[PDB]
Design a protein around this ligand. Structure first.
Ligand code: ANP
Ligand code: MG
Lengths: 136, 107
């Protein structure tokens, strides 16, 4: 339908927002999140949207072209766990992102992690969030 | 049976040059404390180390760390021969390199 007034107009009406060609931005509403890719911008690839600026959204859907799902589980999709998530990050992100440094240092970090808790408290969600945030 | 043949054992100090001998054995061999001596083990390996007094050790035994034992290719319970070598001379230059496996990474 009229996606423009439904999603974009509230998203740009109030604040002057920067935009760069090829970037995808997420708009939440209607019990769903919609990813909009900036096909073209003027006068250059970098621009700032203003009330007088024209917005054209009459084209067909665009493919993902190897882009990652912006709705994938992340640290922002997990709530009620800040201390535990901090411990998990400190254990995991440092070696996985920087394995060369750890193998050069010679110190052995822990590898066995056990998330225990009542059903429905996360666990599966936390692991997916960590994996998606580390790309491992 | 010789006064210079001794059974290696575990050491106290972890330095790679200090070797502790029972003062009785050193006096028997007429060895000056804190001087240089030469130790021969198995095969044909030998090392040069500074000796020291330690009454805890026994006369028929000498205490060395794993480094010196590895250099001598001798395990615990083996026998080594000790010879006084106070004539050791200071070296003008030494070319030393690390090992690949141990130095992997750090550069
Ligand atoms: N702490 C949380 N924060 C946000 N959403 C959560 C949280 N815990 C659970 N959820 C939501 O509830 C869903 C079901 O819980 P989930 O964590 O997937 O089950 P689980 O803990 O793996 N169950 P079990 O393995 O049987 O103990 C999740 O996929 C999220 O959508
Ligand atoms: Mg589960």
């Amino acid at each position: 339908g009229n996606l423009f007034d439904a999603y974009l107009k509230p998203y740009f009406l109030e604040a002057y927002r920067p935009v760069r060609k090829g970037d995808l931005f997420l708009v939440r509403g209607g019990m769903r999140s919609v990813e909009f890719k900036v096909i073209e911008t003027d006068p250059a690839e970098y621009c700032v949207v203003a009330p007088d600026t024209e917005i054209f959204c009459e084209g067909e859907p665009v493919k993902r072209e190897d882009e990652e799902r912006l709705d994938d589980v992340g640290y922002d999709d997990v709530g009620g766990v800040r201390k535990q998530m901090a411990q998990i990050r400190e254990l995991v992100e440092l070696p996985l992102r920087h394995p060369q440094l750890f193998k050069s240092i010679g110190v052995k970090p822990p590898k066995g992690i056990l998330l225990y808790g009542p059903p429905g408290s996360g666990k599966t969600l936390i692991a997916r969030a960590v994996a998606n945030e580390t790309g491992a | 049976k010789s006064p210079n043949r001794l059974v290696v054992d575990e050491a106290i100090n972890d330095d790679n040059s200090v070797v502790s001998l029972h003062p009785a054995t050193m006096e028997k061999l007429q060895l000056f404390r804190g001087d240089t001596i030469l130790i021969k083990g198995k095969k044909r390996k030998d090392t040069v180390c500074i000796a020291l007094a330690d009454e805890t050790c026994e006369e028929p035994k000498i205490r060395m760390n794993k480094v010196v034992r590895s250099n001598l290719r001798v395990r615990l319970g083996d026998v080594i021969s000790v010879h006084q070598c106070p004539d050791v001379k200071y070296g003008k230059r030494v070319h030393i390199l690390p090992v690949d496996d141990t130095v992997e990474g750090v550069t």
